[PDB]
Structure formats: structure tokens, C-alpha cells
Design an enzyme around this catalytic site. Structure first.
Site: not given
Ligand SMILES: Nc1nc2c(ncn2[C@@H]2O[C@H](COP(=O)(O)OP(O)(O)=S)[C@@H](O)[C@H]2O)c(=O)[nH]1
Ligand SMILES: CN(C)C(=O)C(CCN1CCC(O)(c2ccc(Cl)cc2)CC1)(c1ccccc1)c1ccccc1
Ligand SMILES: CC(C)CCC[C@@H](C)[C@H]1CC[C@H]2[C@@H]3CC=C4C[C@@H](O)CC[C@]4(C)[C@H]3CC[C@]12C
Ligand SMILES: CC(C)CCC[C@@H](C)[C@H]1CC[C@H]2[C@@H]3CC=C4C[C@@H](O)CC[C@]4(C)[C@H]3CC[C@]12C
Lengths: 54, 286, 350, 337
Positions: C196, C200, C44, C39, C174
């Protein structure tokens, strides 16, 4: 946890009660298989150019 | 006496070391490394041009030795054609190598989708074709002329002799010395400026030393081209401009300038091939 | 030798021609690998890049993404309700306790994303409580999705799973795909290939040599995780484990000279969290002030000092919010530098 | 809870000293009377060029003429080893491929990798080119090996610690082979197609049952990740190549170690093993740009197959024993005789 350990113990019990012949007869069987097919092995006895498709 | 043996010695030494360097480049580029990259094809064709251009040096030297050309009209025709053709090819492949490096540096995506090996192949083929487009009229135009029984061969022209002389001189000056050095200077200047602006060549001692190494080798290329091509073209222009009385120093200086040009074509492969990091990587493993 | 098998030779020749064309089309592109902690915002980031460049999303894709939205809201409210059992935060009244009881009852029997209006009313009445807002403020003591506010502030009044959600809903959610995720977008005549590693969770070593040859590694580090902790042993830091993961990636044998585009994500949360919580929670020997600029530069310089080959391998540390247009421009500049380096590797120049 | 482990330990000790009590001799002590193979040299008869990325796996054909190879360029090239030709080049939906297969009847070709899906391809479609026939999903880890039992079934290895046995037409896992404690790397299928072994990250090889669906034996001895595995031609033994710079021959009847194939000045791992027709030669593709030729009865190197400009990643011997194929990361395959 408990069920995983019980499953592992049952698997090891299943792995322990099988029959195991001697290493000597198995190695002799491997030797016999190797000497019974060494005539037909192309890598061991390469034909120069007659039956080579390459 | 002394002048004859000095001219023979200088032509002989520049010919043997040019052939040795070009053939070492040939053997390396056909055995150690391969022509799967664009710059290797450029170096190979430059080696061809320099090797075949300096292969006619012993014939000119023995021509000066006896003062006569007993080889015949057909052999002097092919020698003249080979010399002009394989010098123009070398000059134009230097131009396209400079253009290739500038495109690689300043235009990265264009270098990705443009610098395929096949594109280098068609560039080299068009290079030899464009050199032949000026070397073939020289083939049709050169002949053996009779001068007091010494049968010295010189390029004879049409009825306006002076007009064709001026046309050939201006076409070999402005299309083989002026435009090449201008293209080289602008391409390498933009390349050096972009390599100064790029992030991973500045901000540390090692990156500054690397940028110094590229700048030094580029300035060595341009400096040796200038110092080995200025005396020939200026001397030819001032010979065509004002009459010069015949003397020992005049002929010695003319042959020395000719030797300077052939020394440039000699040391061109040791300056491009043997300064490349690809060649060092493929040679230090031996 | 002019035999019947000349058709086979012609088929091999046309196969070679088509394969060479496909190979040069592939070599005319750029391939980047995403790495980071759990996370951190990588998905994103690439979803934003795909949205601003390629296209939006399909109807059925938005359907499974709304299913993911419903699963995320359910998990978030379950975590934010069960956090009171360990953090000892009392409810406002017994009505909200009954609402939480029926929420547990409804979560005990889940079929699909039906979203009964009684459940939505339970969500609304639970979120409209002083204790739940207090535990939302105190959520740094446990784990919570950073988009839970977005779900519980706007997606609470959805009232029906009948229409596709907005693009913003798809962007912030996601999937849980265990396989590798591959996205494609074009930015100024370059074809970017984001890889990505979604899921994994398998040894990180039998396919880390499959990426030896990528252009760059877009690493992602959550800036807002300096004060958060992990609820597994209560003895490690999320920022510290991100630091050691970056250290293990940077010292890898397959990425000796591969440039890193280090993104320090979630700066909009860091700048609003550093006002109250100091940076000294993460680094106890930090001596600077509790301001966004100095703390952000401190995190950047620690992550850059993790690198052991700074004289040859370049790191592009950029503060990003994962909802920016300049996010793709930073990547473009970094990969243009790497492409210039690669085009300088031949010709005997670099 | 904790009472099960202290007696699982004594069950392990019972297995260990039962294997030790059945080890009155070794393989090397009774093979000393055999004349050695000598120093055999094999030449690259065919140099299959045309790949661009690092080839990771290849599989031969039962007709000993065709073969298939998977590479990171996203292509499954089906070669012709005799004529150096290419009869098919299947584009992959996911370029991250780590393994490939070929049918015993020759009609189908499998592949799989980091997309966790085994793609079966039909080479005998009368409608045109080769297209995907079935996508077997259900693994939560990367597919690392796949062997067709026949046109109806496949046995697949995966990094989710579990193996599988897919019915292709239904597209479902009929049997799941769990029991490892590491990511399963490669599986070899017995000649009678009733059992199969598989190595994994936990430095153990498990001999399963294809029909019944349980683990029958567990072989230990390696100190690292077992990358490669291959049955001996009679089906009563197998050889495993691991990352600890050694190969080991095990036994399905003596149920213990038979012989190690180690050499000094070798530290690189082994990613491919394959046996000759008579089983006298154990061909092991190492990581030091080579592929050593071992003797499976004397444990000495009878040769080496040099000529690759990167890590050899996959081997193969034809079903008639004629040739040896050797892929590598330098985008080239080679044939040896
Ligand atoms: N409000 C706000 N939320 C954010 C920002 N940047 C990222 N997120 C959120 O952080 C969660 C993990 O993202 P992600 O799914 O990519 O995790 P991962 O691939 O490592 S498992 C997602 O729900 C994103 O919306 C930001 O600037 N502002
Ligand atoms: C035209 N100019 C001014 C040049 O400098 C020249 C070639 C001049 N060429 C040399 C051979 C020659 O002496 C000759 C006479 C008779 C015979 Cl049988 C054989 C040869 C006749 C004159 C050149 C280049 C490099 C080094 C030295 C000279 C050149 C420049 C550019 C492109 C092509 C050629
Ligand atoms: C006597 C000589 C000077 C006459 C002209 C020679 C011409 C025909 C020669 C000289 C240089 C040659 C080229 C040199 C290099 C290559 C690269 C190689 O991979 C394919 C052939 C190709 C593209 C050659 C084509 C033919 C060529 C252009
Ligand atoms: C002078 C320095 C700075 C540069 C030298 C390069 C050029 C300009 C030189 C090289 C060779 C030189 C020529 C060599 C010999 C002669 C013959 C003499 O009777 C008059 C001058 C003249 C004709 C020279 C003119 C200038 C010249 C063409």
C-alpha cells in the site's frame, strides 16, 4: 502566501548580491587543474599490467 | 545393389541432418541462450542424448555395407551401449519434459516451489543414472559372435536364451514405448484441458488462436512420437511372435522402420527447441 | 592458491549460499501493489485479509489505533459541525449551539487522547439533534468519513481511554504514515506481499518503476463516490478522477502486461444510495434504470473500457464490500491465473 | 501579497543579466588548443555477480578496495573489488531501497528509500554480525540520496522537497535545507565537506552551506528532472545529469552554465554521473543500456561502456582514480579500468 513570497524574495536578494568572478578565469582554472592532475589519472593514462590491482 | 545404396543413402542423410540439428541446438544453447531455466537444461540433455545416439548410425550403415564388423568386440560393445543408453535417455527426458509442462500448468504453486534449476539438474542426473541402470547390463551382455565368417555382432544371453530374449523385448516395449506414451498422453491431455479452462486463453480471437497453437504443437509432438515409434515395436513383437521368411522387402522394411526411429530422434530437437518462443525471442535479435 | 585469504573466500561462499536461499524464498512468493483514489477502502481490505489469515493486533498497536480513533472522531465531528456554517442548517435549540461552542473551545486546545466526559456528553447531545441528523443525511454535499457513523453510534460511549479497542475499531481506522506500508499473509501456500502506498504524495513517477515486476495491481474504486464531489473547485467528479487515475495506471509503461484486480468497493453504500440518488449525477449520458445491477454493470464496463489492451492484459472486476471472506479468494484466483501465465511464459508454450 | 512577485521577477532578471554580463567567453572556446583524449576503451575487469533484483545505487570505499551496493532484493552487499568477494550482506528491514552510502572511515554504511528512514549500519561490531545502529526518521518523503560527512553526521536527500543534516547519535535533524519546488533527487558532497549541491524535480540545482544552513546559489538550464549530480574534484564546479537526455557542467564561481554534454541520437535520460580524478572524464550512466564516457573540457564522447543488459542506474570512481564501477538493473555490477 505572503510570508512564503517574502521568504522567496529574501532568498533571491541573498542570491543576487554575491560576488561572481569571470567565466574565463574559472575555465582557465579548471583547465589548469585538469592538466595538473592528468599525470596521476589512471583512467587517462592506464598502466598495462604493473600497478593494476584488477 | 539398389537396396544397398538406398539403405546407405537413407542412413547417411538421417545421420547428417540429425547431427546438424543437434549441433545447431548445442551452439545456440551454449552461446545465444543459457541453461538458467529448467526447460533449457532439459533441451540441452535431450540434444546430448539425440546427438550421441545418432553418432553410431555410420557404424551400423557400414556394418550393413560389408556385412561384417571389422571394428572389433570393444568398439561394438561401446556402440551398442551408447545406442541403448542414449536412446533411453532421450525417451526418459521426453517423459520428464511432459511431466514438467503438466506440473507447470495444472499445479501452479507446486511449479513455483518445485521447478528450480537445481531441481532440474538433479532430475537430469537421475535420468542419466536410471538410463545407465539398464544400459550397463547391455554393456556386460553384448559381444561379438561368429556367423559363417561374417563376425556379425549380436547380443548373446545366458543359458535360457529365449527367456532373456523375451525379458529384454518386454522391458524395452513396456518401459520404453507403452509407459512413455501413456504418461505423455495423460499429462498433455490434462494440460490441454486446464488451458481450455483458464480465463486468459478463451473469450477472444487472439486467445483462442493462442490455445489453438499450443494444442496444435502438443498434438504434433504426440502424433510424431506415435507415427515414429509404432512400426518398430509392433514389427519387433510380431517378429518375435511368428517366423518371417527372408526376402528383399522384409529387410528393406526393417531398415526403413529403423530409419523412422532415427528420424524421430533427428527431428526431436527441431521440434522442441526451434518451436519454443524463448528460442524465437533469443534468435530474432541475433 | 592456498593463501591466508581463503577465509575471505569461505566467507564469500557462505554469504552467497545464504543470499541464494533468501532469494529463492523471496521468489517463492507473490507481490501485489495497491492503487486507488483517496478513501477508497484499500487499507480496510488488506486489514481484513490480515485479520482473517495472519493474526489480530497487539496491545500497543491497538493503543495508537485508538489514538487514531480519537483523532478521527474529533475530525468527523468538527467537519459535521462546521458543515452547517456553509450549508445553512439551523440547530434544534440554543443549548445545542452552546454545546457546539464549547466543542469548538475544547477543539481549540488539544493535548492528547484524554476524552473528558464533558466532551463525550457534548458529543452525545450534539449527535442527538434533528439538525445534525439532517446534515448527516445531506452529507453528500460535502466530505465526510464513511465510518463516522460507526464512531458516533458505538464509540461515543467509550467513557475512558483505559482499555484497548476492539478489532473492528482497528480495522476501520488507518494511520497517516507517509512511508510505504507492507503487509504479509498466507493464503493456500502463497505468501502475499501487499504494498500500500500510504501517503507518498511525491510525483508518482520516481518510484513507479520500482514496481515493474509485481504480479498484479489491486486497484480500488469507491462505488459510493459517484454522487460525491470534491470541495476544492466544485467542477470535478471523484468517480471521474478515479477513472482517469485508473487510465493513467493502466497505460503505464511499467505495467504493460501486469494484470489488474479491479475491486469496486463499498457496494453496501452504493446499493442503498442508488435508491434515492440516481447514477445520472455522475454520468449525465447514462440511459439505464436506477437499479443496483444495471448501474454497477455500467460502472464496471466504463472502467473496463478505460483499458486499451484488453486482448493481452486481463482485468478482474469484482464487486466487494471490504468485509468479505471471498475478497481474498478473488485475489487468489487472479494471482493463480497470473502464475499460470508466468509458468507458461517459459518452456516455449505461451 | 501580489506586489512581491512582480519584484521577485526583476530580482530574477537582475541575477540573469548579471550572469550574462559575466560571460565574455565559454569553456569550449579556450579548450580548442588541448589535444583530445581520443577513443579510449575500458574492459570489464571484474563482474560482481550475486544480486538478483535491480540494483539502484552503489557507493565506493575511501580505501578504493571495498564498495557497497543496494538492490531491491533487500540486501546491502559489501563487495571486494580486487578479489570479487563478499565481506557482508546486510538484510534490510524495508526492501524498497533507492540509495546507499559508505563511511569515509569505512565503519558505517547507510541506506534508505520508500520507507522514509535512513538506516545506519555498524560494520565493526565485535558482538557478531552487522546490525542497525540508528534509524534516522523525520523525512516525510522517500530517501533518494545519503552521504556521510563523517562517522558523526550525514547529509540526506528526500522527495519531501527538503534535504537534511542528521547528527547520528542524537538521531535528529540539526539543519534542514529547504528552498526547492520539487522532489530532491541526489546530492553530491564537496571534497572539503563544507558545501554540497543537490538536484531536484524542479530542474534546478542548489548549492547549500553545511555549517550555516542556507542556499547560496541556484543553477537552472535543464528542462526535466535532474537525477544525478557530482562535484568536480577541486570543489569549484559540478556536473548534473537530467532526464532531458543531456548533462550540464555548472560553476560555483562564475555561477552559470559552463558546458553542455549532448549528442544526437540520444533521447534516454541520465541517472548517474561521476568524475575522474583529474576531472577530464565525465562518466555518465545513461538509460540506453550503456554508460557514455565524456570529456569535461571538449564536450565530446571519448568512449562508451557497454555490457549491461538493462538500465545503468549508478556509477562510481575510486578515490585514487583507479577504477570505475557500474551497477545496473540486470542485477550485476562491473568494474572498469
Ligand atoms: N460502512 C462501510 N465502510 C467502509 C466500507 N468500505 C470501506 N469503508 C470505510 O471507508 C474508509 C476509507 O477506508 P481506507 O482507510 O482504506 O482509505 P484509503 O486507504 O484509500 S486512504 C474506512 O474507514 C472504511 O471503513 C464498507 O463497505 N462499509
Ligand atoms: C530395442 N529396440 C527394439 C529398438 O528399436 C532401439 C535399438 C535397437 N538396436 C538398434 C541398433 C542395433 O541395430 C545395433 C546392432 C549392432 C551394433 Cl554394433 C550397433 C547397433 C541393434 C538394435 C531403437 C531405437 C531408436 C531407433 C532405432 C532402434 C531402442 C529402443 C529403445 C531404447 C533403446 C534402443
Ligand atoms: C559417453 C556418455 C554418454 C556417458 C555418460 C555421460 C554423463 C556422465 C554426462 C552426460 C550428460 C551430462 C550432464 C549434462 C548437463 C549438465 C548440466 C550442466 O550445467 C552441469 C553438468 C550436467 C549435469 C552433466 C553431468 C554429466 C552428464 C550426466
Ligand atoms: C498397416 C498400417 C495400418 C500400419 C502399419 C504399421 C505396422 C503394423 C507395420 C509396419 C511394417 C509392417 C511389416 C512390413 C513387412 C512385412 C513383411 C511381410 O512379408 C509380412 C508383413 C510384414 C511383417 C509387415 C507387418 C505390419 C508392419 C509391422
Amino acid at each position: 502566501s505572503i510570508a512564503q513570497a517574502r521568504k522567496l524574495v529574501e532568498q533571491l536578494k541573498m542570491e543576487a548580491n554575491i560576488d561572481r568572478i569571470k567565466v574565463s578565469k574559472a575555465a582557465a582554472d579548471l583547465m589548469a587543474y585538469c592538466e595538473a592532475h592528468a599525470k596521476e589519472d589512471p583512467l587517462l593514462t592506464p598502466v598495462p599490467a604493473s600497478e593494476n590491482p584488477f | 545393389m539398389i537396396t544397398a545404396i538406398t539403405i546407405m543413402a537413407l542412413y547417411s542423410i538421417v545421420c547428417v541432418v540429425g547431427l546438424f540439428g543437434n549441433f545447431l541446438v548445442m551452439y545456440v544453447i551454449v552461446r545465444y541462450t543459457k541453461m538458467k531455466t529448467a526447460t533449457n537444461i532439459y533441451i540441452f540433455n535431450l540434444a546430448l542424448a539425440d546427438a550421441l545416439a545418432t553418432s553410431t548410425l555410420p557404424f551400423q550403415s557400414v556394418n550393413y555395407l560389408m556385412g561384417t564388423w571389422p571394428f572389433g568386440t570393444i568398439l561394438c560393445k561401446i556402440v551398442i551401449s551408447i545406442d541403448y543408453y542414449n536412446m533411453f535417455t532421450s525417451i526418459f527426458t521426453l517423459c520428464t519434459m511432459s511431466v514438467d509442462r503438466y506440473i507447470a500448468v495444472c499445479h501452479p504453486v507446486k511449479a513455483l516451489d518445485f521447478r528450480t534449476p537445481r531441481n532440474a539438474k538433479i532430475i537430469n542426473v537421475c535420468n542419466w543414472i536410471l538410463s545407465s541402470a539398464i544400459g550397463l547390463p547391455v554393456m556386460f551382455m553384448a559381444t561379438t559372435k561368429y556367423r559363417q565368417g561374417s563376425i556379425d555382432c549380436t547380443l548373446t544371453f545366458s543359458h535360457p536364451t529365449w527367456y532373456w530374449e523375451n525379458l529384454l523385448k518386454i522391458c524395452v516395449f513396456i518401459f520404453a514405448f507403452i509407459m512413455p506414451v501413456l504418461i505423455i498422453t495423460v499429462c498433455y491431455g490434462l494440460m490441454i484441458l486446464r488451458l481450455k479452462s483458464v480465463r486468459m486463453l478463451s473469450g477472444s480471437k487472439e486467445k483462442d488462436r493462442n490455445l489453438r497453437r499450443i494444442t496444435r504443437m502438443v498434438l504434433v509432438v504426440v502424433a510424431v512420437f506415435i507415427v515414429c515409434w509404432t512400426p518398430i515395436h509392433i514389427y519387433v513383437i510380431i517378429k518375435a511372435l511368428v517366423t518371417i521368411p527372408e526376402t528383399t522387402f522384409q529387410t528393406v522394411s526393417w531398415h526403413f522402420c529403423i530409419a523412422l526411429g532415427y528420424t524421430n530422434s533427428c527431428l526431436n530437437p527441431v521440434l522442441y527447441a526451434f518451436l519454443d518462443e524463448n528460442f524465437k525471442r533469443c534468435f530474432r535479435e541475433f | 592458491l592456498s593463501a591466508e585469504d581463503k577465509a575471505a573466500v569461505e566467507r564469500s561462499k557462505m554469504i552467497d549460499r545464504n543470499l541464494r536461499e533468501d532469494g529463492e524464498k523471496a521468489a517463492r512468493e507473490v507481490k501485489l501493489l495497491l492503487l486507488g483514489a483517496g478513501e477508497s477502502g484499500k487499507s480496510t481490505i488488506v486489514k481484513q485479509m490480515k485479520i482473517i489469515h495472519e493474526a489480530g493486533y497487539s496491545e500497543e498497536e491497538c493503543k495508537q489505533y485508538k489514538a487514531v480513533v480519537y483523532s478521527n472522531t474529533i475530525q468527523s465531528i468538527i467537519a459535521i459541525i462546521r458543515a452547517m456554517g456553509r450549508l445553512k442548517i439551523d440547530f434544534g435549540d440554543s443549548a445545542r449551539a452552546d454545546d457546539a461552542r464549547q466543542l469548538f473551545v475544547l477543539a481549540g486546545a488539544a493535548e492528547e487522547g484524554f476524552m473528558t466526559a464533558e466532551l463525550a456528553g457534548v458529543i452525545k447531545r450534539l449527535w442527538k439533534d434533528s439538525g445534525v441528523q439532517a446534515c448527516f443525511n445531506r452529507s453528500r454535499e460535502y466530505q465526510l468519513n464513511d465510518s463516522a457513523a460507526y464512531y458516533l453510534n458505538d464509540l461515543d460511549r467509550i467513557a475512558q481511554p483505559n482499555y484497548i479497542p476492539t478489532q473492528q475499531d482497528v480495522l476501520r481506522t488507518r494511520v497517516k504514515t507517509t512511508g510505504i506500508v507492507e503487509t504479509h499473509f498466507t493464503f493456500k501456500d502463497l505468501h502475499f506481499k501487499m504494498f500500500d502506498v500510504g501517503g507518498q504524495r511525491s510525483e508518482r513517477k520516481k518510484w513507479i518503476h520500482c514496481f515493474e515486476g509485481v504480479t498484479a495491481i489491486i486497484f480500488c474504486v469507491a462505488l459510493s463516490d459517484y454522487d460525491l464531489v470534491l470541495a476544492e473547485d466544485e467542477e470535478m467528479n471523484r468517480m471521474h478522477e478515479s477513472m482517469k487515475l485508473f487510465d493513467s495506471i493502466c497505460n503505464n509503461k511499467w505495467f504493460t502486461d501486469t494484470s489488474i484486480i479491479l475491486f469496486l468497493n463499498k457496494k453496501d453504500l452504493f446499493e442503498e444510495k442508488i435508491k434515492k440518488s440516481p447514477l445520472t449525477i455522475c454520468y449525465p449520458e447514462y440511459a439505464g434504470s436506477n437499479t443496483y445491477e444495471e448501474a454497477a454493470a455500467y460502472i464496471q464496463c466504463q472502467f473496463e473500457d478505460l483499458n486499451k489492451r484488453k486482448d493481452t492484459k486481463e482485468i478482474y472486476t469484482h464487486f466487494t464490500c471490504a468485509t468479505d471472506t471471498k475478497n481474498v479468494q478473488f485475489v487468489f484466483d487472479a494471482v493463480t491465473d497470473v502464475i499460470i501465465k508466468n509458468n507458461l511464459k517459459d518452456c516455449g508454450l505461451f | 501579497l501580489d506586489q512581491l512577485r512582480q519584484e521577485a521577477e526583476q530580482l530574477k532578471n537582475q541575477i540573469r543579466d548579471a550572469r550574462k554580463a559575466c560571460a565574455d567567453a565559454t569553456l569550449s572556446q579556450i579548450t580548442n588548443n588541448i589535444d583530445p583524449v581520443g577513443r579510449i576503451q575500458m574492459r570489464t575487469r571484474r563482474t560482481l555477480r550475486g544480486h538478483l533484483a535491480k540494483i539502484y545505487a552503489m557507493h565506493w570505499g575511501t580505501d578504493s578496495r571495498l564498495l557497497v551496493s543496494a538492490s531491491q532484493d533487500g540486501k546491502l552487499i559489501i563487495w571486494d573489488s580486487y578479489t570479487t568477494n563478499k565481506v557482508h550482506a546486510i538484510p534490510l528491514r524495508s526492501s524498497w531501497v533507492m540509495t546507499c552510502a559508505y563511511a569515509p572511515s569505512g565503519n558505517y554504511v547507510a541506506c534508505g528509500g520508500l520507507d522514509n528512514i535512513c538506516s545506519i549500519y555498524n560494520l565493526k561490531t565485535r558482538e557478531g554480525n552487522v546490525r542497525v545502529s540508528r534509524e534516522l526518521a523525520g523525512h516525510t518523503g522517500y530517501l533518494s540520496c545519503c552521504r556521510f560527512l563523517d562517522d558523526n553526521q550525514i547529509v540526506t536527500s528526500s522527495g519531501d522537497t527538503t534535504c537534511a543534516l542528521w547528527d547520528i547519535e542524537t538521531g535528529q535533524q540539526t539543519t534542514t535545507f529547504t528552498g526547492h519546488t520539487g522532489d530532491v533527487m541526489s546530492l553530491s558532497l564537496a571534497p572539503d565537506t563544507r558545501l554540497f549541491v543537490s538536484g531536484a524535480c524542479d530542474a534546478s540545482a542548489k548549492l547549500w552551506d553545511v555549517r550555516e544552513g542556507m542556499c547560496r546559489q541556484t543553477f537552472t538550464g535543464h528542462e526535466s528532472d535532474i537525477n544525478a549530480i557530482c562535484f568536480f574534484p577541486n570543489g569549484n564546479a559540478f556536473a548534473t545529469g537530467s532526464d532531458d537526455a543531456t548533462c550540464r557542467l555548472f560553476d560555483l564561481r562564475a555561477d552559470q552554465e559552463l558546458m553542455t554534454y549532448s549528442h544526437d541520437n540520444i533521447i534516454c535520460g541520465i541517472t548517474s554521473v561521476s568524475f575522474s580524478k583529474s576531472g577530464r572524464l565525465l562518466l555518465a550512466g545513461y538509460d540506453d543500456f550503456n554508460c557514455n564516457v565524456w570529456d569535461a573540457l571538449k564536450a565530446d564522447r571519448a568512449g562508451v561502456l557497454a555490457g549491461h543488459d538493462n538500465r545503468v542506474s549508478c556509477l562510481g570512481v575510486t578515490d585514487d582514480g583507479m577504477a570505475v564501477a557500474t551497477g545496473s538493473w540486470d542485477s550485476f555490477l562491473k568494474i572498469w579500468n
